[PDB]
mmCIF file with all atom_site columns, C-alpha atoms (C1' of nucleotides) in Angstrom:
data_model
loop_
_atom_site.group_PDB
_atom_site.id
_atom_site.type_symbol
_atom_site.label_atom_id
_atom_site.label_alt_id
_atom_site.label_comp_id
_atom_site.label_asym_id
_atom_site.label_entity_id
_atom_site.label_seq_id
_atom_site.pdbx_PDB_ins_code
_atom_site.Cartn_x
_atom_site.Cartn_y
_atom_site.Cartn_z
_atom_site.occupancy
_atom_site.B_iso_or_equiv
_atom_site.pdbx_formal_charge
_atom_site.auth_seq_id
_atom_site.auth_comp_id
_atom_site.auth_asym_id
_atom_site.auth_atom_id
_atom_site.pdbx_PDB_model_num
ATOM 1   C CA    . UNK A 1 1  ? 182.917 69.073  4.624   1.00 37.19 ? 1  UNK A CA    1
ATOM 2   C CA    . UNK A 1 2  ? 180.675 69.258  1.809   1.00 39.34 ? 2  UNK A CA    1
ATOM 3   C CA    . UNK A 1 3  ? 180.817 65.445  1.288   1.00 39.85 ? 3  UNK A CA    1
ATOM 4   C CA    . UNK A 1 4  ? 180.199 64.985  5.078   1.00 40.37 ? 4  UNK A CA    1
ATOM 5   C CA    . UNK A 1 5  ? 177.227 67.305  5.190   1.00 41.31 ? 5  UNK A CA    1
ATOM 6   C CA    . UNK A 1 6  ? 175.570 65.874  1.945   1.00 43.58 ? 6  UNK A CA    1
ATOM 7   C CA    . UNK A 1 7  ? 176.123 62.321  3.259   1.00 46.17 ? 7  UNK A CA    1
ATOM 8   C CA    . UNK A 1 8  ? 174.445 63.113  6.413   1.00 45.31 ? 8  UNK A CA    1
ATOM 9   C CA    . UNK A 1 9  ? 171.415 64.845  4.551   1.00 46.46 ? 9  UNK A CA    1
ATOM 10  C CA    . UNK A 1 10 ? 171.379 61.835  2.492   1.00 48.20 ? 10 UNK A CA    1
ATOM 11  C CA    . UNK A 1 11 ? 170.929 59.394  5.164   1.00 48.10 ? 11 UNK A CA    1
ATOM 12  C CA    . UNK A 1 12 ? 168.621 61.394  6.970   1.00 51.75 ? 12 UNK A CA    1
ATOM 13  C CA    . UNK A 1 13 ? 166.226 61.484  3.750   1.00 51.90 ? 13 UNK A CA    1
ATOM 14  C CA    . UNK A 1 14 ? 166.693 57.832  3.180   1.00 56.05 ? 14 UNK A CA    1
ATOM 15  C CA    . UNK A 1 15 ? 165.719 56.953  6.999   1.00 52.58 ? 15 UNK A CA    1
ATOM 16  C CA    . UNK A 1 16 ? 163.116 59.421  7.787   1.00 53.94 ? 16 UNK A CA    1
ATOM 17  C CA    . UNK A 1 17 ? 162.376 61.599  4.699   1.00 52.82 ? 17 UNK A CA    1
ATOM 18  C CA    . UNK A 1 18 ? 162.533 65.097  5.856   1.00 53.48 ? 18 UNK A CA    1
ATOM 19  C CA    . UNK A 1 19 ? 164.531 67.198  8.167   1.00 55.33 ? 19 UNK A CA    1
ATOM 20  C CA    . UNK A 1 20 ? 166.203 70.575  8.649   1.00 55.07 ? 20 UNK A CA    1
ATOM 21  C CA    . UNK A 1 21 ? 168.158 71.824  5.394   1.00 51.51 ? 21 UNK A CA    1
ATOM 22  C CA    . UNK A 1 22 ? 165.932 69.851  3.030   1.00 51.96 ? 22 UNK A CA    1
ATOM 23  C CA    . UNK A 1 23 ? 165.089 73.234  1.547   1.00 51.89 ? 23 UNK A CA    1
ATOM 24  C CA    . UNK A 1 24 ? 168.618 73.440  -0.105  1.00 49.24 ? 24 UNK A CA    1
ATOM 25  C CA    . UNK A 1 25 ? 167.647 70.306  -2.460  1.00 48.27 ? 25 UNK A CA    1
ATOM 26  C CA    . UNK A 1 26 ? 164.379 71.884  -3.819  1.00 50.54 ? 26 UNK A CA    1
ATOM 27  C CA    . UNK A 1 27 ? 165.548 71.649  -7.444  1.00 52.99 ? 27 UNK A CA    1
ATOM 28  C CA    . UNK A 1 28 ? 166.483 68.137  -7.233  1.00 54.22 ? 28 UNK A CA    1
ATOM 29  C CA    . UNK A 1 29 ? 163.177 67.216  -5.236  1.00 54.70 ? 29 UNK A CA    1
ATOM 30  C CA    . UNK A 1 30 ? 160.793 69.076  -7.585  1.00 56.52 ? 30 UNK A CA    1
ATOM 31  C CA    . UNK A 1 31 ? 162.842 67.881  -10.681 1.00 58.39 ? 31 UNK A CA    1
ATOM 32  C CA    . UNK A 1 32 ? 163.081 71.550  -12.083 1.00 60.40 ? 32 UNK A CA    1
ATOM 33  C CA    . UNK A 1 33 ? 165.609 72.308  -14.798 1.00 60.73 ? 33 UNK A CA    1
ATOM 34  C CA    . UNK A 1 34 ? 168.612 74.253  -13.672 1.00 58.55 ? 34 UNK A CA    1
ATOM 35  C CA    . UNK A 1 35 ? 168.050 78.106  -13.543 1.00 55.68 ? 35 UNK A CA    1
ATOM 36  C CA    . UNK A 1 36 ? 164.179 77.658  -13.502 1.00 50.47 ? 36 UNK A CA    1
ATOM 37  C CA    . UNK A 1 37 ? 162.154 79.779  -11.160 1.00 52.29 ? 37 UNK A CA    1
ATOM 38  C CA    . UNK A 1 38 ? 160.420 78.136  -8.367  1.00 53.67 ? 38 UNK A CA    1
ATOM 39  C CA    . UNK A 1 39 ? 156.831 77.723  -8.039  1.00 55.67 ? 39 UNK A CA    1
ATOM 40  C CA    . UNK A 1 40 ? 155.110 80.409  -6.122  1.00 53.66 ? 40 UNK A CA    1
ATOM 41  C CA    . UNK A 1 41 ? 151.766 81.775  -4.718  1.00 50.23 ? 41 UNK A CA    1
ATOM 42  C CA    . UNK A 1 42 ? 151.379 83.360  -8.080  1.00 48.70 ? 42 UNK A CA    1
ATOM 43  C CA    . UNK A 1 43 ? 151.612 79.992  -9.697  1.00 50.80 ? 43 UNK A CA    1
ATOM 44  C CA    . UNK A 1 44 ? 148.665 78.932  -7.515  1.00 52.41 ? 44 UNK A CA    1
ATOM 45  C CA    . UNK A 1 45 ? 146.606 81.849  -8.811  1.00 53.31 ? 45 UNK A CA    1
ATOM 46  C CA    . UNK A 1 46 ? 144.706 81.193  -11.915 1.00 54.87 ? 46 UNK A CA    1
ATOM 47  C CA    . UNK A 1 47 ? 146.121 82.662  -15.027 1.00 54.18 ? 47 UNK A CA    1
ATOM 48  C CA    . UNK A 1 48 ? 143.318 85.145  -15.228 1.00 55.49 ? 48 UNK A CA    1
ATOM 49  C CA    . UNK A 1 49 ? 143.929 86.815  -12.007 1.00 53.38 ? 49 UNK A CA    1
ATOM 50  C CA    . UNK A 1 50 ? 144.178 90.406  -11.136 1.00 50.92 ? 50 UNK A CA    1
ATOM 51  C CA    . UNK A 1 51 ? 147.200 92.022  -9.267  1.00 50.36 ? 51 UNK A CA    1
ATOM 52  C CA    . UNK A 1 52 ? 147.201 95.126  -7.159  1.00 50.25 ? 52 UNK A CA    1
ATOM 53  C CA    . UNK A 1 53 ? 150.463 96.593  -5.814  1.00 46.75 ? 53 UNK A CA    1
ATOM 54  C CA    . UNK A 1 54 ? 149.828 99.156  -2.740  1.00 44.94 ? 54 UNK A CA    1
ATOM 55  C CA    . UNK A 1 55 ? 152.648 101.734 -2.405  1.00 46.39 ? 55 UNK A CA    1
ATOM 56  C CA    . UNK A 1 56 ? 154.263 100.684 -5.581  1.00 47.68 ? 56 UNK A CA    1
ATOM 57  C CA    . UNK A 1 57 ? 157.290 103.116 -5.517  1.00 44.18 ? 57 UNK A CA    1
ATOM 58  C CA    . UNK A 1 58 ? 158.230 101.306 -2.165  1.00 41.06 ? 58 UNK A CA    1
ATOM 59  C CA    . UNK A 1 59 ? 157.032 97.837  -2.822  1.00 39.87 ? 59 UNK A CA    1
ATOM 60  C CA    . UNK A 1 60 ? 158.554 97.332  -6.177  1.00 36.06 ? 60 UNK A CA    1
ATOM 61  C CA    . UNK A 1 61 ? 162.433 97.938  -4.965  1.00 36.21 ? 61 UNK A CA    1
ATOM 62  C CA    . UNK A 1 62 ? 161.680 95.390  -2.124  1.00 33.40 ? 62 UNK A CA    1
ATOM 63  C CA    . UNK A 1 63 ? 160.454 92.770  -4.676  1.00 32.58 ? 63 UNK A CA    1
ATOM 64  C CA    . UNK A 1 64 ? 163.745 93.473  -6.707  1.00 32.09 ? 64 UNK A CA    1
ATOM 65  C CA    . UNK A 1 65 ? 166.051 93.389  -3.706  1.00 30.42 ? 65 UNK A CA    1
ATOM 66  C CA    . UNK A 1 66 ? 165.236 89.773  -2.585  1.00 33.41 ? 66 UNK A CA    1
ATOM 67  C CA    . UNK A 1 67 ? 167.076 87.961  -5.476  1.00 34.11 ? 67 UNK A CA    1
ATOM 68  C CA    . UNK A 1 68 ? 170.117 89.972  -5.029  1.00 31.90 ? 68 UNK A CA    1
ATOM 69  C CA    . UNK A 1 69 ? 170.335 89.571  -1.243  1.00 32.50 ? 69 UNK A CA    1
ATOM 70  C CA    . UNK A 1 70 ? 169.760 85.718  -1.426  1.00 30.61 ? 70 UNK A CA    1
ATOM 71  C CA    . UNK A 1 71 ? 172.448 85.476  -3.959  1.00 29.15 ? 71 UNK A CA    1
ATOM 72  C CA    . UNK A 1 72 ? 174.771 87.501  -1.960  1.00 30.38 ? 72 UNK A CA    1
ATOM 73  C CA    . UNK A 1 73 ? 174.059 85.575  1.166   1.00 32.83 ? 73 UNK A CA    1
ATOM 74  C CA    . UNK A 1 74 ? 174.599 82.009  -0.494  1.00 34.37 ? 74 UNK A CA    1
ATOM 75  C CA    . UNK A 1 75 ? 177.598 82.911  -2.767  1.00 32.89 ? 75 UNK A CA    1
ATOM 76  C CA    . UNK A 1 76 ? 179.913 82.484  0.200   1.00 31.52 ? 76 UNK A CA    1
ATOM 77  C CA    . UNK A 1 77 ? 178.220 79.349  1.204   1.00 30.33 ? 77 UNK A CA    1
ATOM 78  C CA    . UNK A 1 78 ? 178.638 77.469  -1.949  1.00 27.33 ? 78 UNK A CA    1
ATOM 79  C CA    . UNK A 1 79 ? 182.007 78.924  -2.694  1.00 26.25 ? 79 UNK A CA    1
ATOM 80  C CA    . UNK A 1 80 ? 183.424 77.560  0.543   1.00 29.01 ? 80 UNK A CA    1
ATOM 81  C CA    . UNK A 1 81 ? 182.187 74.010  -0.210  1.00 29.01 ? 81 UNK A CA    1
ATOM 82  C CA    . UNK A 1 82 ? 179.290 74.080  2.471   1.00 30.23 ? 82 UNK A CA    1
ATOM 83  C CA    . UNK A 1 83 ? 176.319 73.422  -0.021  1.00 28.91 ? 83 UNK A CA    1
ATOM 84  C CA    . UNK A 1 84 ? 175.890 72.132  -3.244  1.00 27.04 ? 84 UNK A CA    1
ATOM 85  C CA    . UNK A 1 85 ? 175.921 74.550  -6.296  1.00 27.70 ? 85 UNK A CA    1
ATOM 86  C CA    . UNK A 1 86 ? 172.330 73.346  -7.080  1.00 26.23 ? 86 UNK A CA    1
ATOM 87  C CA    . UNK A 1 87 ? 171.345 75.298  -3.783  1.00 23.67 ? 87 UNK A CA    1
ATOM 88  C CA    . UNK A 1 88 ? 171.369 78.449  -5.876  1.00 22.87 ? 88 UNK A CA    1
ATOM 89  C CA    . UNK A 1 89 ? 168.065 77.554  -7.306  1.00 21.21 ? 89 UNK A CA    1
ATOM 90  C CA    . UNK A 1 90 ? 166.272 77.778  -3.973  1.00 21.99 ? 90 UNK A CA    1
ATOM 91  C CA    . UNK A 1 91 ? 165.794 81.466  -4.525  1.00 21.02 ? 91 UNK A CA    1
ATOM 92  C CA    . UNK A 1 92 ? 163.065 84.174  -4.838  1.00 17.87 ? 92 UNK A CA    1
ATOM 93  C CA    . UNK A 1 93 ? 161.889 85.295  -8.081  1.00 17.19 ? 93 UNK A CA    1
ATOM 94  C CA    . UNK A 1 94 ? 163.790 87.856  -10.070 1.00 16.01 ? 94 UNK A CA    1
ATOM 95  C "C1'" . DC  B 2 1  ? 140.668 12.290  133.005 1.00 16.03 ? 1  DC  B "C1'" 1
ATOM 96  C "C1'" . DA  B 2 2  ? 144.204 16.503  134.609 1.00 13.91 ? 2  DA  B "C1'" 1
ATOM 97  C "C1'" . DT  B 2 3  ? 148.718 17.707  135.718 1.00 12.52 ? 3  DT  B "C1'" 1
ATOM 98  C "C1'" . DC  B 2 4  ? 153.643 18.341  135.256 1.00 13.36 ? 4  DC  B "C1'" 1
ATOM 99  C "C1'" . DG  B 2 5  ? 158.815 19.041  131.866 1.00 12.52 ? 5  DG  B "C1'" 1
ATOM 100 C "C1'" . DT  B 2 6  ? 164.918 25.119  130.942 1.00 16.69 ? 6  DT  B "C1'" 1
ATOM 101 C "C1'" . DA  B 2 7  ? 163.371 28.790  123.314 1.00 17.77 ? 7  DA  B "C1'" 1
ATOM 102 C "C1'" . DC  B 2 8  ? 160.856 22.552  118.451 1.00 15.42 ? 8  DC  B "C1'" 1
ATOM 103 C "C1'" . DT  B 2 9  ? 160.783 20.392  113.316 1.00 11.10 ? 9  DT  B "C1'" 1
ATOM 104 C "C1'" . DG  B 2 10 ? 159.135 20.282  108.815 1.00 9.16  ? 10 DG  B "C1'" 1
ATOM 105 C "C1'" . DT  B 2 11 ? 156.518 22.235  104.742 1.00 10.09 ? 11 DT  B "C1'" 1
ATOM 106 C "C1'" . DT  B 2 12 ? 153.856 26.426  102.180 1.00 5.59  ? 12 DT  B "C1'" 1
ATOM 107 C "C1'" . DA  B 2 13 ? 152.462 31.846  100.530 1.00 4.80  ? 13 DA  B "C1'" 1
ATOM 108 C "C1'" . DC  B 2 14 ? 154.948 36.358  99.419  1.00 2.69  ? 14 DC  B "C1'" 1
ATOM 109 C "C1'" . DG  B 2 15 ? 158.113 40.033  98.233  1.00 2.00  ? 15 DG  B "C1'" 1
ATOM 110 C "C1'" . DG  B 2 16 ? 162.717 41.215  96.154  1.00 2.00  ? 16 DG  B "C1'" 1
ATOM 111 C "C1'" . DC  B 2 17 ? 166.862 39.906  92.478  1.00 2.00  ? 17 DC  B "C1'" 1
ATOM 112 C "C1'" . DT  B 2 18 ? 168.554 38.018  88.510  1.00 2.00  ? 18 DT  B "C1'" 1
ATOM 113 C "C1'" . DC  B 2 19 ? 168.889 35.424  84.049  1.00 2.00  ? 19 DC  B "C1'" 1
ATOM 114 C "C1'" . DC  B 2 20 ? 167.182 34.534  79.585  1.00 2.00  ? 20 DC  B "C1'" 1
ATOM 115 C "C1'" . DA  B 2 21 ? 163.991 34.392  75.320  1.00 2.00  ? 21 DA  B "C1'" 1
ATOM 116 C "C1'" . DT  B 2 22 ? 161.772 37.034  71.743  1.00 2.00  ? 22 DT  B "C1'" 1
ATOM 117 C "C1'" . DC  B 2 23 ? 160.802 40.725  68.968  1.00 2.00  ? 23 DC  B "C1'" 1
ATOM 118 C "C1'" . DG  B 2 24 ? 162.656 48.613  59.833  1.00 2.00  ? 24 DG  B "C1'" 1
ATOM 119 C "C1'" . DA  B 2 25 ? 162.065 53.247  59.365  1.00 2.00  ? 25 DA  B "C1'" 1
ATOM 120 C "C1'" . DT  B 2 26 ? 163.321 58.068  57.868  1.00 2.00  ? 26 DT  B "C1'" 1
ATOM 121 C "C1'" . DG  B 2 27 ? 165.966 61.483  55.859  1.00 2.00  ? 27 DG  B "C1'" 1
ATOM 122 C "C1'" . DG  B 2 28 ? 169.134 62.999  52.277  1.00 2.00  ? 28 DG  B "C1'" 1
ATOM 123 C "C1'" . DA  B 2 29 ? 171.281 62.923  47.702  1.00 2.00  ? 29 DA  B "C1'" 1
ATOM 124 C "C1'" . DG  B 2 30 ? 171.939 61.880  42.872  1.00 2.00  ? 30 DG  B "C1'" 1
ATOM 125 C "C1'" . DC  B 2 31 ? 169.642 60.897  38.380  1.00 2.00  ? 31 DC  B "C1'" 1
ATOM 126 C "C1'" . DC  B 2 32 ? 166.105 60.767  34.480  1.00 2.00  ? 32 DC  B "C1'" 1
ATOM 127 C "C1'" . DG  B 2 33 ? 162.369 62.809  32.050  1.00 2.00  ? 33 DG  B "C1'" 1
ATOM 128 C "C1'" . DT  B 2 34 ? 159.847 66.803  30.917  1.00 2.00  ? 34 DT  B "C1'" 1
ATOM 129 C "C1'" . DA  B 2 35 ? 158.562 71.553  30.715  1.00 2.00  ? 35 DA  B "C1'" 1
ATOM 130 C "C1'" . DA  B 2 36 ? 160.314 76.397  30.455  1.00 2.00  ? 36 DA  B "C1'" 1
ATOM 131 C "C1'" . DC  B 2 37 ? 163.329 80.137  28.869  1.00 2.00  ? 37 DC  B "C1'" 1
ATOM 132 C "C1'" . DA  B 2 38 ? 166.994 82.740  26.641  1.00 2.00  ? 38 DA  B "C1'" 1
ATOM 133 C "C1'" . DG  B 2 39 ? 169.654 83.617  22.418  1.00 2.00  ? 39 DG  B "C1'" 1
ATOM 134 C "C1'" . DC  B 2 40 ? 172.770 87.981  7.609   1.00 2.00  ? 40 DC  B "C1'" 1
ATOM 135 C "C1'" . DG  B 2 41 ? 172.384 90.659  3.141   1.00 2.00  ? 41 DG  B "C1'" 1
ATOM 136 C "C1'" . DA  B 2 42 ? 170.551 93.690  -0.617  1.00 2.00  ? 42 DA  B "C1'" 1
ATOM 137 C "C1'" . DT  B 2 43 ? 167.650 97.492  -2.055  1.00 2.00  ? 43 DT  B "C1'" 1
ATOM 138 C "C1'" . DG  B 2 44 ? 165.029 101.584 -2.510  1.00 2.00  ? 44 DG  B "C1'" 1
#
DNA sequence: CATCGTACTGTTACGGCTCCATCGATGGAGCCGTAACAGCGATG
């Protein structure tokens, strides 16, 4: 199943260039090293920017929970041979 | 020019009968293309 899905995605990339499911190969596309965090809106901001968190006692746990939720969702997919192991890097920042 | 002789022949108009030539369109159904609509997990 993994081979069939990857072959279909590779053919779609070679012929057209972009399609659904292209987000799972973000690490390969951007050339990032394994385990590196993805570029985000904070990276777009200048290094001398100012950050304000409104209702911090609620916002901060929301920031924390995204990575755990995404990893829990993707663990079953990667385990059962549906997506490549590199799909773990298409994750929100810890 | 006058009179007489036991119901005369042939050729044309006109009405009725019959044969023959001459002559796509509309609604229903199926299909294609296009627009429209409905229908996981972790944390505090």
